[PDB]
């Protein structure tokens, strides 16, 4: 995120880091329950990638993080890689996350919910802070 | 990428308005947000856009695509979760 700021540690407990086998962070995701993570289809996740829950400082070795294996990658069949429409993938975890103060689920909306233009929301992540 | 998790508040746009920036790239299953002095950027992809309603945070967007230079005066584009949640529900149900 450009021109954001550092989060209170553990205050976005659904936020996970998707890392490849070399430990490189390449995308974010959100837990929606102990067994499932929602992310973007264009992240190109494979079952050799890892979901990391409970992390704040990716430079720290003292956090009690959970490195969770991915059993299967459900890319929404409606996803269009040419227009990037319907950009959503579900990850089914091999073993459930253990929910704690720093690891828990985000809510999902009803299909009919209205989130109007002008509403302030929040985005989080470990993306670049300067391009 | 920054070592520590970042956050930013940012407003939702209407699609109509977002099309002033991105034109026909904007589909119904997309929602735009930002153009407010902040921007999602490479490595944020796939994470949450959440809005607080009735005291709880709800996933309204998934970081999807935007300005190649993470321009803070251009809206970012997010997968619109209301358009996708019936699929999520279906998928969890069957697996």
């Amino acid at each position: 995120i450009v021109n954001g700021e550092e989060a209170v540690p553990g205050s976005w407990p659904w936020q996970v880091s998707l890392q490849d086998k070399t430990g490189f962070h390449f995308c974010g995701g959100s837990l929606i329950n102990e067994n499932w993570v929602v992310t973007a289809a264009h992240c190109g996740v494979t079952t050799s990638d890892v979901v990391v829950a409970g992390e704040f400082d990716q430079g720290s070795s003292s956090e009690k993080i959970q490195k969770l294996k991915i059993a299967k990658v459900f890319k929404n069949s409606k996803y269009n890689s040419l227009t990037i429409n319907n950009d959503i993938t579900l990850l089914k975890l091999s073993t459930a996350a253990s929910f704690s103060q720093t690891v828990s689920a985000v809510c999902l909306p009803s299909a009919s919910d209205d989130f109007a233009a002008g509403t302030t929301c929040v985005t989080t992540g470990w993306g670049l802070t300067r391009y | 990428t920054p070592d520590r998790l970042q956050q930013a508040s940012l407003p939702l746009l209407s699609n109509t308005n977002c099309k002033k920036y991105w034109g026909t790239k904007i589909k119904d299953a997309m929602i735009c947000a930002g153009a407010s002095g902040v921007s999602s950027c490479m490595g944020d992809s796939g994470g949450p856009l959440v809005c607080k309603k009735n005291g709880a945070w709800t996933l309204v967007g998934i970081v999807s695509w935007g300005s190649s230079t993470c321009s803070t005066s251009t809206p970012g584009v997010y997968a619109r979760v209301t358009a996708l949640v019936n699929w999520v529900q279906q998928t969890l149900a069957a697996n």
């Binding site: 989060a7 209170v8 540690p9 553990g10 205050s11 976005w12 407990p13 929606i32 704690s100 103060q101 720093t102 828990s104 689920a105 985000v106 809510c107 999902l108 929040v122 | 956050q7 508040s9 005291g55 709880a56 945070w57 709800t58």
Partner: peptide, 10 residues
């Protein structure tokens, strides 16, 4: 869902 045990701040 949706309610962090550790409350986010601005």
């Amino acid at each position: 869902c949706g309610v962090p045990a550790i409350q986010p701040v601005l």
